[PDB]
Coordinates of C-alpha atoms in Angstrom, one line a residue:
Chain A
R1 CA 85.0 79.3 83.8
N2 CA 82.4 81.5 85.6
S3 CA 84.3 84.1 87.6
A4 CA 83.1 87.6 89.2
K5 CA 85.0 90.2 90.7
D6 CA 83.0 92.4 92.8
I7 CA 79.2 92.0 93.8
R8 CA 76.8 93.8 96.0
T9 CA 73.5 92.3 97.3
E10 CA 71.2 94.6 99.2
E11 CA 67.9 94.5 100.2
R12 CA 66.9 90.6 100.3
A13 CA 69.0 89.7 97.6
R14 CA 70.7 86.5 96.9
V15 CA 74.0 85.4 95.0
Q16 CA 75.1 82.3 93.7
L17 CA 78.6 81.1 92.1
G18 CA 78.9 77.8 90.1
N19 CA 76.2 76.2 87.7
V20 CA 72.6 75.8 87.6
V21 CA 71.3 72.1 87.4
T22 CA 67.5 71.5 86.7
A23 CA 65.6 68.7 86.8
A24 CA 64.6 69.5 83.1
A25 CA 68.1 68.6 82.0
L26 CA 68.5 65.3 83.6
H27 CA 70.8 64.9 87.0
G28 CA 73.9 67.0 87.7
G29 CA 76.2 65.3 84.9
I30 CA 78.4 68.2 85.3
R31 CA 81.0 69.3 82.4
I32 CA 79.1 69.1 79.0
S33 CA 79.7 72.4 77.1
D34 CA 82.2 75.1 78.5
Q35 CA 82.9 76.9 75.2
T36 CA 82.7 80.2 76.2
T37 CA 84.2 81.9 79.4
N38 CA 82.2 83.9 81.8
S39 CA 83.5 86.9 83.6
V40 CA 81.7 90.0 85.5
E41 CA 83.4 93.1 87.0
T42 CA 80.6 94.7 89.1
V43 CA 77.1 93.2 89.6
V44 CA 74.6 95.6 91.7
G45 CA 71.4 93.8 93.1
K46 CA 68.9 95.9 95.1
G47 CA 65.2 95.2 95.7
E48 CA 65.0 91.5 96.1
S49 CA 67.3 91.3 92.9
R50 CA 68.9 87.7 92.2
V51 CA 72.3 87.3 90.9
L52 CA 73.2 84.2 89.3
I53 CA 77.0 83.4 88.1
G54 CA 77.3 80.3 86.4
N55 CA 75.6 78.9 82.9
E56 CA 72.3 77.1 83.5
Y57 CA 71.0 73.6 82.1
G58 CA 67.2 73.4 81.9
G59 CA 64.6 74.1 79.3
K60 CA 61.3 73.8 81.3
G61 CA 61.3 77.3 82.3
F62 CA 64.5 79.8 82.0
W63 CA 65.3 80.2 85.5
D64 CA 62.2 82.4 85.9
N65 CA 59.4 81.5 83.5
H66 CA 55.6 81.0 84.0
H67 CA 53.8 83.3 81.3
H68 CA 50.6 81.7 79.7
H69 CA 49.0 84.9 78.6
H70 CA 48.7 85.4 74.9
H71 CA 49.2 88.7 73.4
Chain B
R1 CA 84.0 85.0 75.5
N2 CA 81.5 87.0 78.0
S3 CA 82.7 89.7 79.6
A4 CA 80.4 92.3 81.4
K5 CA 81.8 95.3 83.3
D6 CA 78.9 97.0 85.4
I7 CA 75.4 95.4 85.8
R8 CA 72.9 97.7 87.7
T9 CA 69.7 95.8 88.4
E10 CA 66.9 96.8 90.9
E11 CA 63.3 96.1 91.5
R12 CA 62.9 92.5 91.5
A13 CA 65.2 92.2 88.8
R14 CA 67.3 89.2 87.7
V15 CA 71.1 89.0 86.4
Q16 CA 72.3 85.7 85.0
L17 CA 75.8 85.3 83.8
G18 CA 76.5 82.4 81.5
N19 CA 75.2 80.7 78.3
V20 CA 71.7 79.1 78.4
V21 CA 71.7 75.4 77.3
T22 CA 68.3 74.0 77.3
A23 CA 67.1 70.2 77.0
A24 CA 66.8 71.0 73.1
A25 CA 70.2 71.3 72.8
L26 CA 71.1 68.1 74.0
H27 CA 72.2 65.3 71.5
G28 CA 72.9 68.2 68.8
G29 CA 75.7 70.1 67.2
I30 CA 76.8 72.7 69.6
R31 CA 80.1 73.6 67.6
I32 CA 79.2 75.8 64.4
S33 CA 82.7 78.2 64.6
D34 CA 80.9 80.5 66.8
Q35 CA 84.0 82.6 68.0
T36 CA 82.9 85.8 69.3
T37 CA 84.1 88.0 72.4
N38 CA 80.9 89.7 73.7
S39 CA 81.4 92.7 76.2
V40 CA 79.1 95.1 77.7
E41 CA 80.1 98.2 79.7
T42 CA 77.0 99.1 81.7
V43 CA 73.8 97.4 81.8
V44 CA 70.7 99.2 83.7
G45 CA 67.9 97.0 84.5
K46 CA 64.8 98.8 86.1
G47 CA 61.6 97.4 87.0
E48 CA 61.8 93.5 87.1
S49 CA 64.6 93.5 84.4
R50 CA 66.0 90.2 83.1
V51 CA 69.5 90.3 81.7
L52 CA 71.3 87.7 80.2
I53 CA 75.1 87.5 79.6
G54 CA 76.1 84.8 77.0
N55 CA 74.7 82.8 74.2
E56 CA 71.8 80.4 74.1
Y57 CA 70.7 77.5 72.1
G58 CA 67.2 76.0 71.6
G59 CA 64.4 76.3 68.9
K60 CA 61.7 76.2 70.9
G61 CA 61.7 79.8 71.5
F62 CA 64.0 82.9 71.8
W63 CA 64.7 83.0 75.5
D64 CA 61.3 84.8 76.2
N65 CA 57.8 84.4 74.5
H66 CA 56.7 86.0 71.4
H67 CA 53.8 84.9 69.0
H68 CA 51.3 86.7 66.6
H69 CA 50.1 87.0 63.1
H70 CA 51.8 88.7 60.0
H71 CA 50.3 91.0 57.6
Chain C
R1 CA 82.4 90.3 67.7
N2 CA 80.0 92.3 69.5
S3 CA 80.3 95.4 71.9
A4 CA 77.9 97.5 73.8
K5 CA 78.5 100.7 75.9
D6 CA 75.3 101.8 77.5
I7 CA 72.1 99.6 77.6
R8 CA 69.1 100.8 79.7
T9 CA 66.4 98.3 80.0
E10 CA 63.3 99.4 82.1
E11 CA 59.7 98.2 82.6
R12 CA 59.6 94.7 82.2
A13 CA 62.6 94.6 79.8
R14 CA 65.3 92.0 79.0
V15 CA 68.6 92.2 77.3
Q16 CA 70.6 89.3 75.4
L17 CA 74.4 89.5 75.1
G18 CA 75.3 86.8 72.8
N19 CA 74.5 84.8 69.8
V20 CA 71.1 83.2 69.3
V21 CA 71.5 79.4 67.8
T22 CA 68.4 77.8 67.0
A23 CA 68.0 74.0 67.4
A24 CA 68.0 73.8 63.3
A25 CA 71.6 75.4 63.1
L26 CA 74.1 72.5 63.7
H27 CA 75.5 72.3 60.4
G28 CA 79.0 74.2 60.9
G29 CA 82.7 73.0 61.0
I30 CA 85.7 74.7 62.4
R31 CA 87.5 77.5 60.7
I32 CA 88.8 81.0 61.4
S33 CA 88.5 83.9 59.4
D34 CA 87.2 87.2 59.3
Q35 CA 84.1 88.3 61.2
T36 CA 82.3 91.7 61.7
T37 CA 81.8 93.6 64.5
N38 CA 78.7 95.4 65.6
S39 CA 79.0 98.3 68.5
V40 CA 76.6 100.5 69.5
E41 CA 77.2 103.4 72.0
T42 CA 73.7 103.8 73.7
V43 CA 70.8 101.6 73.8
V44 CA 67.4 102.9 75.6
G45 CA 64.7 100.8 75.8
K46 CA 61.5 101.4 77.9
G47 CA 58.1 99.3 78.0
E48 CA 58.6 95.5 77.0
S49 CA 62.1 96.4 75.6
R50 CA 64.2 93.4 74.1
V51 CA 67.9 94.1 73.3
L52 CA 70.0 91.6 71.3
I53 CA 73.8 92.1 71.1
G54 CA 74.8 89.2 68.9
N55 CA 73.9 87.6 65.5
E56 CA 70.7 85.4 64.8
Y57 CA 70.9 81.9 63.1
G58 CA 67.2 80.6 62.3
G59 CA 65.3 78.9 59.5
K60 CA 61.9 79.9 60.5
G61 CA 62.7 83.6 59.9
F62 CA 64.2 86.1 62.5
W63 CA 64.2 86.7 66.3
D64 CA 60.7 88.0 65.5
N65 CA 57.7 86.0 64.2
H66 CA 55.2 88.9 64.2
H67 CA 55.8 89.6 60.4
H68 CA 56.7 87.6 57.3
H69 CA 56.5 84.2 56.4
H70 CA 57.6 81.1 54.0
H71 CA 57.9 82.5 50.5
Chain D
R1 CA 81.7 97.6 60.4
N2 CA 78.1 98.0 61.3
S3 CA 78.0 100.5 64.4
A4 CA 75.1 102.8 65.9
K5 CA 75.2 105.7 68.2
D6 CA 72.0 106.2 70.1
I7 CA 69.0 103.8 69.6
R8 CA 65.5 104.4 71.1
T9 CA 63.3 101.6 71.7
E10 CA 59.8 102.2 73.2
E11 CA 56.2 100.0 73.7
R12 CA 57.6 96.4 72.9
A13 CA 60.3 97.4 70.7
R14 CA 63.5 95.1 69.9
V15 CA 67.0 96.0 68.4
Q16 CA 69.0 93.7 66.8
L17 CA 72.9 94.2 66.5
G18 CA 75.0 91.7 64.3
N19 CA 74.2 89.9 61.0
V20 CA 71.2 87.5 59.8
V21 CA 72.4 84.1 59.3
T22 CA 69.2 82.1 58.1
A23 CA 69.5 78.2 57.9
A24 CA 69.2 78.4 54.4
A25 CA 72.9 79.3 53.8
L26 CA 75.5 76.5 54.1
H27 CA 79.3 76.3 53.4
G28 CA 79.3 78.1 49.9
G29 CA 80.4 81.6 50.8
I30 CA 79.2 82.3 54.0
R31 CA 82.1 84.6 55.2
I32 CA 80.9 87.5 53.4
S33 CA 83.2 89.6 56.0
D34 CA 83.4 93.4 56.5
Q35 CA 82.4 94.4 52.6
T36 CA 80.3 97.4 53.6
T37 CA 80.2 99.8 56.4
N38 CA 76.7 100.8 57.7
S39 CA 76.7 103.3 60.4
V40 CA 73.6 105.4 61.8
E41 CA 73.8 108.0 64.6
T42 CA 70.3 108.4 65.8
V43 CA 67.6 105.7 65.5
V44 CA 64.1 106.1 67.2
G45 CA 61.5 103.3 67.2
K46 CA 58.4 102.9 69.0
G47 CA 55.3 100.4 68.6
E48 CA 56.4 97.4 67.2
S49 CA 59.8 98.8 66.2
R50 CA 62.5 96.6 64.3
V51 CA 66.0 97.7 64.2
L52 CA 68.0 95.6 62.1
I53 CA 71.7 96.6 62.0
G54 CA 73.7 94.2 59.7
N55 CA 73.8 92.4 56.6
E56 CA 71.3 89.6 55.9
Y57 CA 72.5 86.0 54.0
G58 CA 70.1 83.6 52.7
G59 CA 67.2 82.9 50.4
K60 CA 64.2 84.2 52.5
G61 CA 64.1 87.1 49.9
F62 CA 64.3 89.8 52.6
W63 CA 64.6 90.2 56.4
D64 CA 61.6 92.3 56.8
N65 CA 58.8 93.7 54.1
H66 CA 55.3 93.6 53.7
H67 CA 54.7 92.4 50.3
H68 CA 55.9 92.4 46.4
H69 CA 55.2 95.3 43.9
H70 CA 51.7 95.9 44.1
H71 CA 49.7 98.0 41.4
Chain E
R1 CA 79.6 102.7 52.2
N2 CA 76.4 103.8 54.1
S3 CA 75.7 106.4 56.6
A4 CA 72.5 107.6 58.5
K5 CA 72.2 110.5 60.7
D6 CA 68.7 110.3 62.0
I7 CA 65.9 107.6 61.5
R8 CA 62.2 107.8 63.1
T9 CA 60.5 104.4 62.8
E10 CA 57.4 104.5 64.9
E11 CA 54.1 102.3 64.7
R12 CA 54.8 99.2 63.2
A13 CA 57.7 100.6 61.5
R14 CA 61.2 99.2 61.1
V15 CA 64.7 99.7 59.7
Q16 CA 67.2 97.7 58.6
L17 CA 71.0 98.9 57.7
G18 CA 73.3 96.5 55.6
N19 CA 73.4 94.8 52.1
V20 CA 71.4 91.8 51.2
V21 CA 73.3 88.8 50.0
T22 CA 70.6 86.3 48.3
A23 CA 71.0 82.7 48.4
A24 CA 72.5 82.8 44.6
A25 CA 75.3 84.6 46.3
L26 CA 77.9 86.5 43.9
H27 CA 78.1 84.3 40.7
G28 CA 81.7 86.3 40.0
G29 CA 84.1 88.8 41.6
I30 CA 86.8 88.1 44.0
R31 CA 87.5 92.2 44.2
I32 CA 84.5 92.0 46.7
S33 CA 84.3 96.0 48.5
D34 CA 81.9 98.6 48.8
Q35 CA 81.7 101.2 45.9
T36 CA 78.9 103.6 46.2
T37 CA 78.4 105.7 49.6
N38 CA 75.0 106.6 50.4
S39 CA 74.1 109.0 53.3
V40 CA 70.5 109.9 54.4
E41 CA 70.0 113.2 56.4
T42 CA 66.5 112.4 58.1
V43 CA 64.1 109.6 57.8
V44 CA 60.8 109.9 59.2
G45 CA 58.7 107.2 58.4
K46 CA 55.4 106.5 60.5
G47 CA 52.9 103.8 59.8
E48 CA 54.1 100.4 58.8
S49 CA 57.1 102.2 57.0
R50 CA 60.4 100.7 56.5
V51 CA 63.8 102.1 56.0
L52 CA 66.2 100.2 53.8
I53 CA 69.7 101.4 53.8
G54 CA 72.1 99.4 52.1
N55 CA 72.8 97.3 49.2
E56 CA 69.9 95.2 47.2
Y57 CA 70.8 92.3 45.9
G58 CA 67.9 89.7 46.5
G59 CA 65.7 88.3 43.3
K60 CA 62.3 89.2 43.7
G61 CA 61.2 92.7 42.3
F62 CA 60.5 94.8 45.5
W63 CA 63.2 97.0 46.9
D64 CA 65.5 94.8 45.0
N65 CA 66.2 93.6 41.6
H66 CA 67.7 90.6 39.3
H67 CA 68.1 89.8 35.6
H68 CA 66.3 86.0 35.3
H69 CA 65.5 84.4 32.0
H70 CA 62.7 86.4 30.3
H71 CA 60.9 84.3 27.5

């Protein structure tokens, strides 16, 4: 149960509602966990900000991950 | 349960609403009496900030990257 | 549970709103009892900031690995 | 019980709000519950700072510490 | 209980607020409750400093103590 109330995407901003199926976590099996409910009131995304409403399923790269620089 | 009020993300920020399930959590125990109601009033993200609302499962890292040596 | 009011994350920062369960913490049953509640009024993180709103469950150590070791 | 007012974290700093449940703990009295009330008003950390607000359960010896008693 | 007004930990410094529960746990005592009340004014630790505000109960011999068998 992933629900949002008020979202405002401005300046090349995008918004997705549902779930994230990544090739790293097999195909779109659908319905695996759903142990916790997710609800958000107001989301503000400006300046190419990406709004993602829904649990993800991957592993190799958490949506946005490509760091190889060791500190 | 994961509930959030206001999340303000700008400057190429990324906001995710949901629990992260990596392939490392597949074929494993995802039920350990993890009963908790997490809620945040206002989240301010400026300068490529990353917001994660929910719990995660994995042993190949801690969402982000961190490694070094002790003393 | 966990409750947070004002959380500021800027300059390549990230905030986690949940519990962190490692792939080695799968030995828990199902039972209801008391549970502590941690709540913070304001969190100000600037410059590679990392906020963790929840409990940690790992066998390697803690959320960080820059210090300490085995025994 | 554990609560904080204002926490400042700068220069790759991290703050943990919860409790330390190491994978060294089993079902032999893990539900410690709210025994003590730890409350902090102002917390200022910068440069490899670690703010741990909560109790630690396990046989790791200690969450964070440099070494044993030196002479 | 444990109260702290101002705590500053900069330059590889960290702070911990809570009681330590060793793997040996409480070998006796059903009347679990806090007795002593410690409140610190202002803690200024810089340079690998560590602030320990809570009840010590580990079993090593540094910022903690134990009985053990002495021969």
